């Protein structure tokens with residue numbers, strides 16, 4: 001890993017603490033980093049550090065590396081988790097990201113369902129969706145395809161800012177081998193644009209498909225997509241026209257928008273730009 005000047009962070013100035021989570025990918029822990037906020041070199045900030053597990057594979061490592069490289073290339077945006085730095089020298093690779101205090105969106109929404117712990121308002125639901133649309137409109141503008149959009153891969157900060165995260169599978173628009181059999185083999189199927197598999201391509205319109213599943217997750221307050229449908233049956237059902245039902249209490253308009261995101265023809269789905277303008281409208285006209 002060639003030493004990167006801007007980004008390296010002293011390994012003796014970081015103190016690891018409580019675990020946060022532990023997938024097949026690696027593990028993430030809470031940590032104190034003193035001086036990661038240059039210029040406030042006095043002050044020690046809560047951060048999350050993502051690293052490998054004792055049972056890591058060569059592919060685990062190069063994935064963590066990639067996720068780090070991707071984060072460097074996309075700018076600061078309000079609705080994207082920021083990389084704060086990395087320890088890459090003389091010890092385990094540590095990728096230091098900004099800490100969200102309220103966890104992932106799926107657990108956040110589940111925790112504040114109506115009791116039959118701060119219940120979600122309809123405007124709050126539309127607000128998350130809008131925020132995430134602005135995040136993705138930014139990403140798409142940066143030539144980045146995320147490819148792993150899902151409620152579990154969003155973070156919620158202390159002031160309820162929605163932060164797109166988990167760049168483990170994200171790529172530059174130009175860094176996907178169209179048409180090869182193994183391309184897109186590692187995308188979660190229930191969140192995946194059909195053309196990702198049938199055609200072995202991936203574009204911003206593919207991310208729109210995923211965005212649509214994300215919406216559904218949001219309006220079911222963190223439900224599981226296609227319930228009672230196994231992954232091995234799914235695409236046969238999608239080619240036949242099946243699409244998830246309208247969540248309770250989500251509006252006809254919002255449901256038309258989900259459906260639009262699940263159009264079989266990529267170009268017929270909204271753009272992120274269109275989703276932002278539409279959600280901007282629904283949000284404001286709610287408040288009034």
Ligand SMILES: CCNS(=O)(=O)c1ccccc1Nc1ncnc(Nc2ccc(N3CCC(N4CCN(C)CC4)CC3)c(OC)c2)n1
Pocket residue numbers: 020021022028048050097098099100101102103104107152153154155165166
């Ligand atoms: C999309 C992120 N993807 S990731 O970066 O790979 C990634 C993958 C896994 C974990 C973390 C990250 N990263 C990351 N980065 C910045 N901030 C944060 N905050 C954060 C805060 C709380 C939780 N939790 C989950 C455990 C949960 N307990 C509830 C009660 N039960 C008894 C036991 C479990 C509540 C608190 C959390 O876990 C999601 C994350 N996390």
